[PDB]
Design a protein around this ligand. Structure first.
Ligand SMILES: *[C@@H]1O[C@H](CO[C@H]2O[C@@H](C)[C@@H](O)[C@@H](O)[C@@H]2O)[C@@H](O[C@@H]2O[C@H](CO)[C@@H](O)[C@H](O)[C@H]2NC(C)=O)[C@H](O)[C@H]1NC(C)=O
Ligand SMILES: *[C@@H]1O[C@H](CO[C@H]2O[C@@H](C)[C@@H](O)[C@@H](O)[C@@H]2O)[C@@H](O[C@@H]2O[C@H](CO)[C@@H](O)[C@H](O)[C@H]2NC(C)=O)[C@H](O)[C@H]1NC(C)=O
Ligand SMILES: *[C@H]1O[C@H](CO[C@H]2O[C@@H](C)[C@@H](O)[C@@H](O)[C@@H]2O)[C@@H](O[C@@H]2O[C@H](CO)[C@@H](O)[C@H](O)[C@H]2NC(C)=O)[C@H](O)[C@H]1NC(C)=O
Ligand SMILES: *[C@H]1O[C@H](CO[C@H]2O[C@@H](C)[C@@H](O)[C@@H](O)[C@@H]2O)[C@@H](O[C@@H]2O[C@H](CO)[C@@H](O)[C@H](O)[C@H]2NC(C)=O)[C@H](O)[C@H]1NC(C)=O
Ligand SMILES: *[C@@H]1O[C@H](CO)[C@@H](O)[C@H](O)[C@H]1NC(C)=O
Ligand SMILES: *[C@@H]1O[C@H](CO)[C@@H](O)[C@H](O)[C@H]1NC(C)=O
Ligand SMILES: *[C@@H]1O[C@H](CO)[C@@H](O)[C@H](O)[C@H]1NC(C)=O
Ligand SMILES: *[C@@H]1O[C@H](CO)[C@@H](O)[C@H](O)[C@H]1NC(C)=O
Ligand SMILES: *[C@@H]1O[C@H](CO)[C@@H](O)[C@H](O)[C@H]1NC(C)=O
Ligand SMILES: *[C@@H]1O[C@H](CO)[C@@H](O)[C@H](O)[C@H]1NC(C)=O
Ligand SMILES: *[C@@H]1O[C@H](CO)[C@@H](O)[C@H](O)[C@H]1NC(C)=O
Ligand SMILES: *[C@@H]1O[C@H](CO)[C@@H](O)[C@H](O)[C@H]1NC(C)=O
Ligand SMILES: *[P@@](C)(=O)OCC(C)C
Ligand SMILES: *[P@@](C)(=O)OCC(C)C
Ligand SMILES: [Br-]
Ligand SMILES: [Br-]
Ligand SMILES: [Ca+2]
Ligand SMILES: [Ca+2]
Ligand SMILES: [Ca+2]
Ligand SMILES: [Ca+2]
Ligand SMILES: [Ca+2]
Ligand SMILES: [Ca+2]
Ligand SMILES: [Cl-]
Ligand SMILES: [Cl-]
Ligand code: NA
Ligand code: NA
Ligand code: NA
Lengths: 527, 527
């Protein structure tokens, strides 16, 4: 029976057998006041204190959110849907510790993605027990509010200031500063990691001055805040908040009154109207996301990055070979998970209109021109592959490389990876390749479980990535030093070396997507 | 009717239609006295002069040689067998010129491989008409003597001094110096190129002082003289010459008498006994090859390379992804062109004994140890693939990279390629991958012929390689400057950049086979 005294009271954990050893898991520890009633849309308030033993022995409620119903019964989509009850009462976190209790263990804090609209820390692919067993690190993950409930903004107004879910993440970081030594963690050795919006979130903590002292370093998987979906303009945030009001019958003249009305709405009515606050979305829409609130974020983040205003520390950044494919089967015409999706030029053109709705005709033609010069055989898959690369390059890969360059120019070591292994268990079809989100299970060490039907080469790839991540967190250097592995060189401006992660042979390469990213980075923003 | 006046007399050529234009071909021009009777085994003697028009309108006799009969009727082997009559009377060369007659064209001189035992300039894959049409270069190729007739050595004795076939190559280089301006060529812009033993030959012309002024630069495809098959020791040459005598009933006490006896033998009896001059050969045996004769080669060539004694000029060097596979089906147990050749550990072990017959048990185990640490799934093809890599790394790839490093250390620009495209027409089975010899058709531009059933991507790869080779010959820089191509960086000590040649995307990579070549280059020579 394992009980830990925290600043707010006692917590009971549970023991787990993992690989012939034990991990102690504390699932569902609260770290804030439930944000209900008058607290809805406000910054998380600090926890009152309890007396008695809080039983942290099951995952807590996931935050309210819309759910992906495009492929019911299909594991490829459903694995990402929440696996605990939805409730506004969702501000909880999990702690996995090695057994016996470590003395001063490095801490890995996971921030999930989901577009800032969805996600929960209790998914199977985020289970931190394998990392605690194998690397003897402590792993922490928190639920944070998503959608309008997490990111509604009327900026400057403390009834709905914006970025509440980023403040939920920050308050969990603070909980780890105050409490983790009780669990055997070193509050001075904390690495944030996250994927997609969780990676964009990690990048914004590098920018936020109230996060500077809450962590040591950062890992960004397929996301960074300069991605075109990651930050909402003040203009679009106000418009969306008042669009939400209009839809829920909460248009008022005093803005504090709009929010008060919005506080009387059933959470379902808020969720049901979120999709419509925008005149046309895309599969990549982030209707309620981070804004420049003057609090968490003091200025436009592109300006902070460019002018070197961020935490000086090491970063590890990477992307997957086919980031954009997952999004094509949520509305691009001629695409389907259930066939090979050989599409025509006309379909490609229609697909750009689906992904680039506010963009001028010239803008869309410039994309077509950059991506359709083949290269050369015709090649029925030409247009199918180009559309996935358009979406992946624009939304994930070029912003990650641009973030990595600008960050490294200010003197800190940066390491960049390109993940190019397709999981042998992937339920999505082959044409979708190495999809967005499908390195995560390798990072959390799921293929280390021999009972799970991953191949032996995958068990080895995962073990090595697990070691590199842990070495990054502990030592700021993502090497695998014992097995004659390829040395991972720092990513510098000028050379731009990156490491490929694959089952066959790790390679050092240079200037990932050089020609494509010149297009998105220097020309497209003008269009 | 196109007639050219040469230093030795008139030659009539023939016109060819190639790609809606014309090439003039002069096939079978003699460049030496036929080396018959008293001239057999001696250095080529210079040509007497003729009066009348020598008709250069068909390929000439190929030199006497044994023929590959392992797969009769099979195009994969038979494409390399000679396609003109065999005769000692074989010292002829071909000239392809653009039409109209160029004014001062760069000259490309092809030296074929065949292990120094076989080969002829008239094979289809060496037809220089496409390069003359497309790049407006002049292409020259010569027949040179092979086997004992080309390389028998009793060194110091001018009746059989050694290296006669390298002297045949040199005398053809001289013919081009004296005659090529008459054809519209620039004798001051001559690039040698060659594959396998033709590449080892090209590398020896960089070392030979009598070749220094006969050419400007050099291209080495899958060969260099530091490869373990390329140069025969004085010891093994004498032993083989006297072994040949013993077998033909020509053992005598006066050595000039051995040679005189050998001059009375039918060329068939010499050919029939060549295989047996060695106690055990391998599929890679070069029984009669280059020696240090004190004439063509003044010292052991490893010493010249190491100490910088060679022509200072630019080089282009490369290898194919699966150099060693071709040799496995000529005697390694469990291999077959007609199945997938999944072999066992025992078979691998037997295969090393086939490829490394004089090598100690410890030597062979060290090879097994370096190549059988997987990497990791088992992977039935593990041993099959390892044996191909052992043979390809030892015999071709590590010596080429070692040659390229040592050459570039003396200040000259070097460019290195790794050819990794498997021809869509390859008659050999898939497991053999990107075989030895199968870049040649890409270099000579055979896929430019749309009538030939190569894919469109192959036509493009060939066009680009043809342009890089021609730019190398003309300008010393193998760039393709007009089509947004990957820039080919010089290969330097320290970084060791190389360019990959493939149908998909050209990449700049570093330190090809670093771990393998450390084994062959620094450790294996001690064994
Ligand atoms: C791959 O499937 C798509 C997607 O839509 C389809 O899903 C299929 C597996 C099948 O059940 C089909 O009946 C279903 O509608 C096909 O595109 C669709 O095809 C029709 C015309 O035949 C269009 O009018 C539809 O609008 C279009 N749907 C979408 C969303 O674009 C697609 O052609 C198919 N591709 C193949 C077989 O190569
Ligand atoms: C692939 O074939 C080899 C090569 O020899 C064979 O060629 C085959 C296609 C077939 O015609 C066969 O009859 C012929 O001998 C096979 O290895 C051979 O197999 C026998 C025992 O079955 C040995 O005793 C032979 O010595 C051996 N030959 C050599 C040269 O090693 C091989 O097993 C086969 N591999 C497969 C099917 O996976
Ligand atoms: C933000 O403000 C308006 C609001 O329009 C919206 O009304 C909402 C409550 C919601 O239901 C939403 O779907 C609807 O679009 C946007 O105006 C839209 O623009 C179109 C033309 O593009 C006009 O027809 C309407 O005013 C309205 N659309 C529809 C379909 O009725 C406006 O575009 C937006 N501002 C932005 C995006 O910067
Ligand atoms: C060079 O000299 C001898 C010559 O032996 C050879 O006789 C030739 C005419 C020819 O037929 C050839 O096959 C034969 O090998 C080599 O001696 C051989 O070595 C073995 C033991 O390895 C002895 O049994 C014999 O002397 C002879 N072999 C056979 C099978 O009869 C000698 O090895 C070689 N020198 C080298 C390789 O450096
Ligand atoms: C916590 O769990 C233990 C079960 O072993 C129990 O004794 C205690 O009452 C629990 N607290 C609850 C249910 O609030
Ligand atoms: C943990 O390590 C830090 C340095 O990273 C040190 O300052 C701290 O006191 C240590 N605490 C322990 C061993 O309890
Ligand atoms: C609006 O109403 C709120 C709350 O009832 C009040 O506190 C605030 O001062 C009012 N402001 C304006 C501008 O009407
Ligand atoms: C290193 O190699 C061993 C044994 O060869 C292997 O079992 C282990 O997984 C490897 N460790 C890492 C961190 O990759
Ligand atoms: C060379 O060819 C032409 C054929 O057009 C002929 O007139 C001449 O006699 C030939 N020379 C020979 C056969 O020696
Ligand atoms: C050919 O070019 C060379 C320089 O490479 C020059 O010296 C020579 O005279 C030229 N000859 C011509 C145009 O006939
Ligand atoms: C051997 O005979 C040759 C040719 O008949 C002769 O010229 C030579 O001087 C002789 N040398 C010896 C050492 O017997
Ligand atoms: C360059 O591109 C053109 C037209 O796009 C093509 O037809 C030609 O083959 C290319 N040239 C080379 C040297 O690759
Ligand atoms: P990630 C799956 O959180 O990506 C955000 C999406 C909206 C581009
Ligand atoms: P190239 C085919 O001439 O290779 C020589 C062989 C004997 C290694
Ligand atoms: Br069009
Ligand atoms: Br053994
Ligand atoms: Ca790629
Ligand atoms: Ca996802
Ligand atoms: Ca490795
Ligand atoms: Ca390879
Ligand atoms: Ca060959
Ligand atoms: Ca290219
Ligand atoms: Cl580069
Ligand atoms: Cl490197
Ligand atoms: Na087209
Ligand atoms: Na084994
Ligand atoms: Na050793």
């Amino acid at each position: 029976d394992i009980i830990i005294a925290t600043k707010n009271g006692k917590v009971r954990g549970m023991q787990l057998t993992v690989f012939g050893g034990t991990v102690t898991a504390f699932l569902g520890i609260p770290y804030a006041q439930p944000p209900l009633g008058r607290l809805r849309f406000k910054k998380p308030q600090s926890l009152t204190k309890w007396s008695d033993i809080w039983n942290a022995t099951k995952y807590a409620n996931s935050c309210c959110q819309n759910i992906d119903q495009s492929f019911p019964g299909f594991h490829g989509s459903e694995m990402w849907n929440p696996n605990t009850d939805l409730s506004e009462d969702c501000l909880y976190l999990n702690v996995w510790i090695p057994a016996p209790k470590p003395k001063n263990a490095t801490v890995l804090i996971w921030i999930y993605g989901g577009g800032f609209q969805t996600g929960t820390s209790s998914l199977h692919v985020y289970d931190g027990k394998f990392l605690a067993r194998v690397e003897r690190v402590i792993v922490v993950s928190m639920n944070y509010r998503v959608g309008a409930l997490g990111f509604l903004a009327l900026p400057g107004n403390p009834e709905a200031p914006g970025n509440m879910g980023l403040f939920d993440q920050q308050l969990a970081l603070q909980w780890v500063q105050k409490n983790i030594a009780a669990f055997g963690g070193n509050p001075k050795s904390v690495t944030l990691f996250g994927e997609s919006a969780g990676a964009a979130s990690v990048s914004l903590h590098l920018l936020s001055p109230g996060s500077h002292s809450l962590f040591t370093r950062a890992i960004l998987q397929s996301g960074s805040f300069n991605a075109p979906w990651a930050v909402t303009s003040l203009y679009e945030a106000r418009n969306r908040t008042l669009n939400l009001a209009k839809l829920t019958g909460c248009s008022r003249e005093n803005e504090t009154e709009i929010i008060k009305c919005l506080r009387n709405k059933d959470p379902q009515e808020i969720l049901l109207n979120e999709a419509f606050v925008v005149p046309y979305g895309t599969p990549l829409s982030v209707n309620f996301g981070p804004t420049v609130d003057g609090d968490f974020l003091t200025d436009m983040p592109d300006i902070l990055l460019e002018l070197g205003q961020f935490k000086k520390t090491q970063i590890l950044v990477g992307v997957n070979k086919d980031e954009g494919t997952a999004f094509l089967v949520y509305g691009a015409p001629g695409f389907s998970k259930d066939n090979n999706s050989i599409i025509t030029r006309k379909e490609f053109q229609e697909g750009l209109k689906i992904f680039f709705p506010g963009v001028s005709e010239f803008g869309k033609e410039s994309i077509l021109f950059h991506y359709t010069d083949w290269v050369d055989d015709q090649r029925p898959e030409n247009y199918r592959e180009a559309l996935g690369d358009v979406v992946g390059d624009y939304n994930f890969i070029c912003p990650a490389l641009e973030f990595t360059k600008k960050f490294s120019e200010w003197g800190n070591n940066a390491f960049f990876y390109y993940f190019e292994h397709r999981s042998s268990k992937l339920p999505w079809p082959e044409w979708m390749g190495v999809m967005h989100g499908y390195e995560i299970e390798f990072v959390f060490g799921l293929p280390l479980e021999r009972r799970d039907q991953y191949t032996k080469a995958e068990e080895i790839l995962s073990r090595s990535i697990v070691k590199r991540w842990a070495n990054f967190a502990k030592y700021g250097n993502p090497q695998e030093t014992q097995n004659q592995s390829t040395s991972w060189p720092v990513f510098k401006s000028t050379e731009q070396k990156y490491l490929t992660l694959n089952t066959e042979s790790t390679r050092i390469m240079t200037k990932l997507r050089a020609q494509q990213c010149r297009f998105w980075t220097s020309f497209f923003p003008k269009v």
